[PDB]
Amino acid sequence: VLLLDVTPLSLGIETMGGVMTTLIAKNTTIPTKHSQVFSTAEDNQSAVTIHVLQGERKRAADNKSLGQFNLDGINPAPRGMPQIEVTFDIDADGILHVSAKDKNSGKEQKITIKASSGLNEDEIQKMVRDAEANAEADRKFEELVQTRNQGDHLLHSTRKQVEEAGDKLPADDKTAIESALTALETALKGEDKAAIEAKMQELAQVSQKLMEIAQQ
């Protein structure tokens, strides 16, 4: 009431693209507990890595690392089907417990992180200033990662829809889709947002019949 305890920086986890995703927002009063459900990046993923992050930078690699831990024993499924409920719990002692739970498999992995862990009074302000300085480069990095994932989704989605469509797909259409995907996958290996969007434009146009089918 004369004071508060507040997280001076956001806490969260690395998500595909190497982007920090916040669970506890900066200047939050402890005790506190936020949860969020994530999934797998790739088919038949047996495990997820949980890399824990302090800071306000959109790149995970510009934030302070607090720890990382695996959750294995993910029973095989498609991408983005498993439910991995991640919880940030800071108790009244300034201690953070991060848990990851496979909501099907019942499995659970925690890490506890000392109140004293992370960046001290000085490094904090340096991080906060840095966030405002490189706020541009970060908005850009973010929409590049959002674009990569869209492209990535649209790649995986399309390949699946080529198999379920099987013979229904006119040879021509396949050839054309086949190669637009190969171009996409290459450009996804790049850093060039425009180029990823271009192979995404290319696929939209050549897939128009593959979609007609998939609707069935």
Binding site: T15, M16, T21, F38, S39, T40, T49, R79
Partner: peptide, 6 residues
């Protein structure tokens, strides 16, 4: 959702 790698 949002995803992670192993």
């Amino acid at each position: 959702a949002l995803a992670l790698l192993p």
